[PDB]
Ligand binder design. Structure first.
Ligand SMILES: [Zn+2]
Ligand SMILES: [Zn+2]
Lengths: 38, 38
């Protein structure tokens, strides 16, 4: 549905995808982003 | 800027917020979502 602003990969193109009422993110985005923000 | 589809909290309302070209998510969303998807 929505592409990752970071991964830009399709919702199903990634092995793990989390769907939200308006936000879509995969595991690499949070894994890489969580490490930076944390 | 954009509210979390899950947290619905403002971009600055959360202590940790990751900004993306079109996706905004905080630590609780990925922490709780990552545990479920993983
Ligand atoms: Zn992603
Ligand atoms: Zn959030």
């Amino acid at each position: 549905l929505l592409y990752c602003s970071f991964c830009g990969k399709s919702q199903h193109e990634v092995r793990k995808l989390i769907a939200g009422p308006s936000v879509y993110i995969c595991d690499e985005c949070v894994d890489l982003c969580n490490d930076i923000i944390r």
